Ligand binder design. Structure first.
Ligand SMILES: *[C@@H]1O[C@H](CO)[C@@H](O[C@@H]2O[C@H](CO)[C@@H](O[C@H]3O[C@H](CO[C@H]4O[C@H](CO[C@H]5O[C@H](CO)[C@@H](O)[C@H](O)[C@@H]5O)[C@@H](O)[C@H](O)[C@@H]4O)[C@@H](O)[C@H](O)[C@@H]3O)[C@H](O)[C@H]2NC(C)=O)[C@H](O)[C@H]1NC(C)=O
Ligand SMILES: *[C@@H]1O[C@H](CO)[C@@H](O[C@@H]2O[C@H](CO)[C@@H](O[C@H]3O[C@H](CO[C@H]4O[C@H](CO[C@H]5O[C@H](CO)[C@@H](O)[C@H](O)[C@@H]5O)[C@@H](O)[C@H](O)[C@@H]4O)[C@@H](O)[C@H](O)[C@@H]3O)[C@H](O)[C@H]2NC(C)=O)[C@H](O)[C@H]1NC(C)=O
Ligand code: HEM
Ligand code: HEM
Ligand SMILES: *[C@@H]1O[C@H](CO)[C@@H](O[C@@H]2O[C@H](CO)[C@@H](O)[C@H](O)[C@H]2NC(C)=O)[C@H](O)[C@H]1NC(C)=O
Ligand SMILES: *[C@@H]1O[C@H](CO)[C@@H](O[C@@H]2O[C@H](CO)[C@@H](O)[C@H](O)[C@H]2NC(C)=O)[C@H](O)[C@H]1NC(C)=O
Ligand SMILES: *[C@@H]1O[C@H](CO)[C@@H](O[C@@H]2O[C@H](CO)[C@@H](O)[C@H](O)[C@H]2NC(C)=O)[C@H](O)[C@H]1NC(C)=O
Ligand SMILES: *[C@@H]1O[C@H](CO)[C@@H](O[C@@H]2O[C@H](CO)[C@@H](O)[C@H](O)[C@H]2NC(C)=O)[C@H](O)[C@H]1NC(C)=O
Ligand SMILES: COc1ccc(-c2noc(CC(=O)O)c2-c2ccc(OC)cc2)cc1
Ligand SMILES: COc1ccc(-c2noc(CC(=O)O)c2-c2ccc(OC)cc2)cc1
Ligand SMILES: CCCCCCCCO[C@@H]1O[C@H](CO)[C@@H](O)[C@H](O)[C@H]1O
Ligand SMILES: CCCCCCCCO[C@@H]1O[C@H](CO)[C@@H](O)[C@H](O)[C@H]1O
Ligand SMILES: CCCCCCCCO[C@@H]1O[C@H](CO)[C@@H](O)[C@H](O)[C@H]1O
Lengths: 553, 553
């Protein structure tokens, strides 16, 4: 017989449970609905469903009406709407986490073993006719052909919203502290056991590497001096595992928390910036605490860099990414009234969703020079040659690519987009419409409703055969964008819940930690509350370059 | 200079932070008070302080007035007070956890490394004059002399509240799933990384041992048949590390989740009962789910045994321990309105606090036979000889010892109480009065106010020199008891917050897990909601003996 859970009968976060040989039951508990399919709405849910404006309309209100938002930002309505964004979006992510690659049900092993990634929806069952359930073809399109035909950049499409490569390397640096997929254990497994903003891309994902990176004097990290400037130390001075070209000159390798940050100059740029910030904070703490040993000067400075990381990513990173006239705010006290679990567990869908390789340009313009991928990838001297001031200045002027819309990935890194499609089939992710229904959206009825477009949609209808068989990552990238925006509807309504739940589920946002004694007094606590990326760069440099998440006018 | 934090200046959960060379500041954030010492009360805190009845008066209301509580238990007030018990006590435990043996401050390492135990108050600083801070003698009393003079049983003092040895072996079995102190790593470190009711004393504290114990058929655990009765399997059949006498006959060893459960017959009694329960639940799930594999039948049955463990410990274990006419209730839905973190981290003070060795009798009466410690400790055939029916029947009739009051530990196990005092000095626990102030109680002004007694109090005043130098564990055990009760005030107000936070901080109590689909439908979910210890015994036996947490009339 056919597995009935292949039909995805349970609506609105209902739980399909097989009974007997061939039957099933949906668990409608606290879904807001009742009935066999969990489709009979309750009274409050019906009222809030008919009074619910569409996400595109909300994007219209938040991106227009500048006279209104100048009033909203100057009053308490800013705090009210910020609390609304946080609670409504993070309510949509399960905490405690539910499933993983091993278990399509709730288990103690899925809870306690943090080596897994979690997942929002279950896998497609093994006994389904179609690889995506019941609708579609008996085999799926070629990932190389989908990437070549629909995701490959032909002409560079710049982000209309003004996004930097300073933004894009910040997004690669920031997201690789909780995206470390284990090559040994396989897909669905992670080495980043913090599952969030722990800065394990700076201090290491385990304790032994952390002690290999620490100076053990004044709480500082180890470092080396080149041309009078502070850089991460050599692997000869900090002997820990760093991926590099086989046959480099170590004594020119640099040791940082993330094993792969040597492979790109912008990633080692940010690692240099944060290391300089760590030791500056250590100087500020030691001035105020002469009695502290090495551990307390270290751990409190780590908490300061964690806090100012979340400050910068909410009020500048997500601010630039949203385009909102509403000025976003990082205040953990906004959640002190609600029931909010201060935990995070990285989802595999959220790993699929941060493949923002369209941000990468055709070439890397640094002043008068223009470097190709072969000149930029794996390059080891460009950081020390130009300096952090000059690479921040050059990356904050070059435009980044638009994420959504399709057909904007360079061919040098298009292979990544290929593997993430193939990995999406290994992990048995559900169809794109099922993730739209899970994150509060209506499924698409046709491919041309997806793309807003005639050619690609019809060729996709030849490849997939049904809209209900479209895969997750191609659906996120081939979706139509909101007008003059970085990406489209599904990247909004799926990416924001994971990202904000990951930012305020950090325990430093809890009532138990969010106080001045945690950060060594009012000095470090105002370092968290006052952090910009301009202060992250220009306080750790000799000159202050142009530093921003957007291009200049 | 003298460390000012040695004086413990910060009151009401204030945080002592050293500034400069010799000064300090208290962090009064969300303490309810303000001022330099955090002693100036706010308006609401003053109102709730003057309107706060004493804990002894609350114990009087909860243990008397049977006509009133017969009305309360039949109405919604039972649900109201239970919510009040849960929210008020667990609010007193920090979640996320704060400190550990390494860090007397908040750190990311204290958060993420679950190998540590946590601690509620910081350690006594190393630069204090007195080992307990500032008040007391330059060295502390001999732990062997305190145990011999004040904790050693002379005549058996039975619990006036009626407590079984079925209770006491349940308390030893239950608490050794989150009390596994690492001999390799030392004090302050634990092997039980679940930090709560994970049943790792049944399924193992790591995954490899878990697969060594699983049958991998129908989700069951491995087992062996002796005299027609189901027992845990031999180590020859389940080859995993089990502590036993060097030179036993394995093929008569039994393999269970906890490495030390072979050393006592009552611990292996409970492990036998829970193993029979696991495979019974596997039969019930397989009847309803013919399609499930081995993993889902296993993990959901584990969640059923976790849930019915918490049901039994709240509505029978803590019920018998309290003596309340208020009938306690396990309903996680009581906390769905509040802000409650579904996490637990075992504290070292709570480890100090569950040393209930006074419960153990002078001898172990089994029917007509009466076994000594040398006949009962390490004995390997008594379980299979009498059977679980007969040992449950015999343990539910023999009285257990009163915990509080002092002078009630048998000499066979008095050495444990010695080491836990010495360990209390290794961990640098603060004085007993400081934990009274931390858990919402006034400190004692004298030793005779502590004991309600003349002789022991004066000899303690010769040994310690000041009431403010009394240690934690001796203060808990030498305290006066509430009238006709198992122990005294400080064991109430310290033990209940850890214990209830540990019971409902389990993620199965969260809104995300507490539903029927988690337990495989209404069958297992009613197995959680209907579990008694009589059902835990008599459904897994041929005959139903007397099974209770209290002696018969
Ligand atoms: C988070 O989860 C992951 C994934 O679950 C964990 O990583 C995996 O851990 C697995 C177990 O440690 C491991 O799988 C094993 O599978 C094969 C086959 O397993 C055998 O199991 C029993 C064992 O029988 C043995 O008995 C004797 C006793 O002494 C042994 O010497 C002898 O070798 C014999 O096999 C057999 O009954 C059965 O038939 C199988 O033969 C093992 O051989 C493997 O070596 C492996 O241990 C798996 O590889 C791990 N990795 C992955 C990617 O799955 C991870 O540990 C967990 N994290 C935490 C913190 O718990
Ligand atoms: C939870 O926390 C606990 C407690 O912190 C963790 O358990 C402990 O982990 C510690 C580190 O893993 C371990 O302490 C070590 O102490 C010293 C460390 O000194 C090292 O460094 C110096 C100098 O640097 C050396 O480094 C290079 C590297 O290649 C050497 O070759 C070279 O010789 C150079 O000098 C040396 O003096 C020293 O040789 C060390 O390299 C070591 O001597 C110890 O052996 C140990 O490694 C501690 O023992 C652990 N246990 C306890 C009870 O503290 C636990 O890991 C953590 N859990 C998690 C999950 O993170
Ligand atoms: C020159 C620029 C870049 C290069 C060379 C590059 C290269 C790669 C490669 C080779 C992988 C491994 C894929 C696989 O093993 O199948 C990867 C994964 C990934 N990429 Fe990039 N990428 C770049 C830019 C970016 C940017 C700007 C982001 C921004 C978010 C990003 C996000 C990711 C993520 C999240 C992963 C998954 C990591 C993991 O699973 O551990 N990439 N990238
Ligand atoms: C015949 C009965 C008992 C014996 C022989 C016994 C023996 C021991 C021993 C030898 C230790 C180790 C102490 C050390 O290494 O310093 C210990 C620890 C402990 N005992 Fe028992 N005990 C008994 C009864 C109980 C009971 C009924 C309880 C009920 C709660 C209990 C609670 C504990 C706890 C919580 C620990 C700490 C465990 C750890 O830190 O890993 N004991 N006991
Ligand atoms: C719940 O969903 C299932 C599957 O979507 C529905 O089952 C289908 O019902 C139609 C009409 O009776 C049948 O023609 C199909 O054969 C059914 N499919 C399966 C797999 O059972 C079911 O009707 C829905 N529940 C309700 C109340 O409408
Ligand atoms: C890595 O980047 C450095 C930039 O310092 C490259 O070296 C420069 O190359 C450009 C043109 O290729 C020259 O105009 C500069 O004068 C060079 N400067 C130095 C200091 O060498 C280097 O070629 C890059 N690596 C690779 C492999 O291309
Ligand atoms: C806060 O607590 C500290 C310590 O209990 C108080 O400081 C003591 O004050 C007395 C009274 O003058 C002195 O004799 C001691 O020498 C002080 N000790 C220390 C370590 O400073 C302090 O007075 C309290 N704060 C207030 C406002 O009373
Ligand atoms: C372990 O317990 C068994 C009981 O099952 C003990 O054996 C009994 O000993 C008593 C006297 O001590 C006899 O009256 C019984 O007839 C014995 N029964 C059996 C089946 O042998 C045994 O002695 C205990 N172990 C130790 C070391 O004392
Ligand atoms: C995919 O990675 C991310 C990261 C962050 C967000 C995110 N978090 O909060 C907000 C504000 C909000 O919730 O609306 C947004 C957002 C919203 C609209 C928007 O339009 C382009 C861009 C970003 C979303 C996805
Ligand atoms: C030390 O180990 C424990 C374990 C459990 C509790 C505990 N948890 O909830 C309640 C009810 C309550 O909160 O009052 C109690 C309790 C209260 C009074 C009481 O008098 C003898 C005995 C137990 C306390 C300590
Ligand atoms: C008028 C300005 C309102 C700002 C509040 C916006 C935050 C609410 O955001 C809402 O989150 C839901 C769940 O993720 C989505 O389903 C909705 O489409 C989206 O608008
Ligand atoms: C209360 C003030 C209401 C002003 C009406 C704003 C109209 C916004 O209209 C929006 O335009 C978008 C395209 O640009 C569409 O995609 C949205 O569905 C639509 O609601
Ligand atoms: C240190 C901050 C103290 C604030 C809360 C007081 C701590 C003790 O709160 C406890 O609540 C229990 C709930 O029923 C009562 O039974 C106890 O009498 C009471 O002591």
């Amino acid at each position: 017989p056919v597995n009935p859970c292949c039909y995805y009968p349970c609506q609105h976060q209902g739980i399909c449970v097989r009974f007997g040989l061939d039957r099933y039951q949906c668990d409608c508990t606290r879904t807001g609905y009742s009935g066999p399919n969990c489709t009979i709405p309750e009274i409050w849910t019906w009222l809030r469903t008919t009074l619910r404006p569409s996400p595109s309309f909300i994007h219209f209100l938040l991106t227009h009406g500048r006279w209104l938002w100048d009033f909203v930002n100057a009053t308490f309505i800013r705090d009210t709407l910020m609390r609304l964004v946080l609670t409504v979006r993070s309510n949509l992510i399960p905490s405690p986490p539910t499933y993983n690659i091993a278990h399509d049900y709730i288990s103690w092993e899925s809870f306690s073993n943090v080596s897994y990634y979690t997942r929002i929806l279950p896998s497609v069952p093994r006994d389904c006719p179609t690889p995506m359930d019941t609708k579609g073809k008996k085999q799926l399109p070629d990932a190389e052909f989908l990437s070549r035909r629909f995701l490959l950049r032909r002409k560079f499409i710049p982000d209309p919203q003004s996004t930097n490569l300073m933004f894009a390397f910040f997004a690669q640096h920031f997201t690789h502290q909780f995206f470390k997929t284990s090559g040994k254990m396989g897909p669905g497994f992670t080495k980043a056991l913090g599952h969030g903003v722990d800065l394990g891309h700076i201090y290491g994902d385990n304790l032994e590497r952390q002690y290999q990176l620490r100076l053990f004097k004044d709480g500082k990290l180890k470092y080396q001096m080149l041309n009078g400037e502070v850089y991460p130390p050599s692997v000869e001075e900090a002997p820990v595992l760093m991926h590099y070209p086989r046959g480099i000159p170590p004594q020119s390798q640099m040791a940082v928390g993330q094993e792969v940050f040597g492979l790109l100059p912008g990633l080692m740029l940010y690692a240099t910036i944060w290391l300089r910030e760590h030791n500056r904070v250590c100087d500020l703490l030691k001035a105020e605490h002469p009695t502290w040993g090495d551990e307390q000067l270290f751990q409190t400075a780590r908490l300061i860099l964690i806090g100012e990381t979340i400050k910068i990513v909410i009020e500048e990173y997500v601010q630039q990414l949203s385009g909102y006239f509403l000025q976003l705010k990082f205040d953990p006290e906004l959640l002190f009234g609600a029931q909010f679990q201060y935990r995070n567990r990285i989802a595999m869908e959220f790993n699929q969703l941060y493949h923002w390789h369209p941000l990468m340009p055709d070439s890397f313009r640094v002043g008068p020079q223009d470097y190709s991928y072969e000149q930029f990838l794996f390059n080891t001297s460009m950081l020390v040659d130009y300096g952090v001031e000059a690479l921040v200045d050059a990356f904050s002027r070059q435009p980044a690519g638009r994420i959504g819309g399709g057909r904007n990935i360079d061919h040098h890194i298009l292979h990544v987009a290929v593997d993430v499609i193939k990995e999406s089939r290994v992990l048995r992710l559900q169809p794109f419409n099922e993730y739209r229904k899970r994150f509060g959206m209506k499924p698409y009825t046709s491919f041309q409703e997806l793309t807003g477009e005639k050619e690609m949609a019809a060729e996709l209808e030849e490849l997939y055969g049904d809209i209900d068989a479209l895969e997750f990552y191609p659906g996120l990238l081939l979706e139509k964008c909101h007008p003059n925006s970085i990406f489209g509807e599904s990247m909004i309504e799926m990416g924001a819940p994971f990202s904000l739940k990951g930012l305020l589920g950090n325990p430093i946002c809890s009532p138990e930690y969010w106080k001045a004694s945690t950060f060594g007094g009012e000095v470090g606590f105002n370092l968290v509350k006052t952090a910009t990326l301009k202060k992250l760069v220009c306080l750790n440099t000799k000159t202050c370059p142009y530093v921003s998440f957007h291009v200049p006018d």
